């Protein structure tokens, strides 16, 4: 997406191994704020955008 237009859509109902998003090696170019990546598979999400 263009930086003034975004990709904002609602992921819903789903499951994933969210830890992939930090534990897969080439993703190691990242950050997190409040939440922490190692907890994400036990943390009950709600709905998701990006």
């Amino acid at each position: 997406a263009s930086v003034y237009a975004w990709n904002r859509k609602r992921i819903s109902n789903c499951v994933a191994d969210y830890s992939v998003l930090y534990n897969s090696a080439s993703f190691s170019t990242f950050k997190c704020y409040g939440v922490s990546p190692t907890k994400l598979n036990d943390l009950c999400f709600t709905n998701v955008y990006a």
Binding site: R8, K9, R10, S12
Partner: protein, 46 residues
């Protein structure tokens, strides 16, 4: 997110909205993200 609610009842007042308490259950929530600022209601005919 387009949130939709409703209530249905028989009535006496033909002109207008009646006095007395009512509250609406949620029909649906939609993920749709639309820029909404205008709308119109619709009929249909043979």
């Amino acid at each position: 997110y387009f949130k939709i609610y409703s209530k249905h009842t028989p009535i006496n007042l033909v002109r207008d909205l009646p006095q007395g308490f009512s509250a609406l259950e949620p029909l649906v929530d939609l993920p749709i993200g639309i820029n909404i600022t205008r709308f119109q209601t619709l009929l249909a005919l043979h």
